[PDB]
Design a protein around this ligand. Structure first.
Ligand SMILES: *[C@@H]1O[C@H](CO)[C@@H](O[C@@H]2O[C@H](CO)[C@@H](O)[C@H](O)[C@H]2NC(C)=O)[C@H](O)[C@H]1NC(C)=O
Ligand code: NAG
Ligand code: NAG
Ligand code: NAG
Ligand code: NAG
Ligand code: NAG
Ligand code: NAG
Length: 258
């Protein structure tokens, strides 16, 4: 899903600090009942990508042909009061509207996150993270500040999914929906490392993953205990075929369909 880069290495999301149940809480967000059920969707996997640079130069990463983008952070320093932030900036392209999400390190108190809805393709990644907080998403672009919860201590997975009619943002354990008709290009550009500035601090404490395939998870709720298991094949987990398929070149149903 990510272009081959030497900086970007893999990593086990569940093996990191404070990430024991990072995916379990996300999977059971909607299934609040008792029993086992097989769900499908653009769900994150266990192996994500960590990308860092020893130097203080500006680096970029590209995710292509993806449908959802998830990321997680580390525990904030002094989260109770003056929380210390770790900067990040990822841009989802589209026409005629594109969305830039930037978490910082004039600005309202504790509102580390900013969302910039812009209609201009020329986005300056070497100047957005170098100016003041009041001169970032100024002008005709729509600026929406938002406060990432520091008390969560990075134990909640953040995510963004989109389509041509609806955009869903998962923050903490809450999913928010926005209705907008926009032609998305299904690629995301992420700027993970740059020189330190007033708003940007040189660090690397972000994991991240892009999901493009239809992932299947079996969920079991036994006496209040919640367990999840990934399925590489729907038929193997359920004993029955699935209706999701990828049409071949020219728009032809594959011969293996049921
Ligand atoms: C994201 O995908 C879109 C859609 O494919 C890309 O836009 C096209 O890019 C190609 C080159 O890859 C150009 O020849 C086309 O003219 C572009 N079309 C439009 C309508 O702009 C876009 O470049 C991709 N973005 C990134 C950052 O890779
Ligand atoms: C994740 O842990 C497993 C063992 O549980 C190990 O084999 C694998 O290499 C780890 N993956 C990464 C990306 O470190
Ligand atoms: C943490 O924040 C509190 C509340 O603002 C503050 O009193 C305290 O000094 C901070 N601790 C630090 C910066 O180590
Ligand atoms: C986050 O960490 C702080 C400091 O250790 C702790 O007081 C707080 O309860 C934690 N929040 C959680 C675990 O939700
Ligand atoms: C990513 O890797 C860097 C070294 O390249 C390391 O310092 C950093 O802690 C890693 N990030 C996470 C979230 O594990
Ligand atoms: C997604 O599905 C395609 C089907 O061709 C497969 O080749 C690819 O490996 C899958 N990707 C992942 C991450 O499972
Ligand atoms: C769910 O868990 C219970 C208790 O461990 C087990 O008996 C049952 O077989 C599980 N169901 C599925 C579908 O895996």
């Amino acid at each position: 899903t990510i272009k081959p880069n030497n900086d970007c290495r893999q990593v086990n999301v569940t093996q990191l600090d404070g990430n024991e149940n990072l995916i379990r809480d996300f999977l059971f967000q909607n299934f609040k009942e008792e029993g086992t059920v097989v769900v499908g969707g653009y769900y994150p996997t266990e192996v994500w990508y960590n990308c860092s640079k020893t130097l203080t130069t500006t680096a970029y990463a590209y995710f292509n042909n993806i449908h959802a983008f998830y990321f997680d952070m580390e525990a904030m320093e002094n989260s109770t009061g003056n929380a210390r932030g770790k900067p990040l900036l990822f841009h989802v392209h589209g026409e005629p509207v594109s969305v830039i999400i930037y978490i910082s390190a004039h600005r309202p108190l504790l509102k580390h996150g900013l969302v910039c809805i812009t209609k201009t393709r020329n986005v300056d990644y070497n100047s957005f993270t170098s100016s003041q907080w009041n001169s970032i998403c100024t002008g005709n672009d729509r600026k929406v500040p938002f406060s990432v919860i520091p008390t969560d201590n990075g134990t909640k997975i953040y995510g963004l999914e989109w389509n041509d009619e609806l955009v869903t943002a998962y923050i903490s354990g809450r999913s928010y929906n926005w209705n907008i008709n926009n032609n998305w290009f299904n690629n995301v550009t992420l700027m993970y490392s740059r020189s330190s500035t007033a708003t940007w601090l040189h660090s690397a404490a972000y994991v991240y993953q892009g999901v493009s395939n239809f992932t299947y998870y079996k969920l079991n709720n036994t006496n209040g205990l919640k367990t999840y298991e990934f399925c590489e094949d729907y038929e193997y987990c359920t004993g029955y075929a699935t209706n999701v398929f990828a049409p071949t070149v020219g728009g032809y149903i594959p011969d293996g369909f049921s």
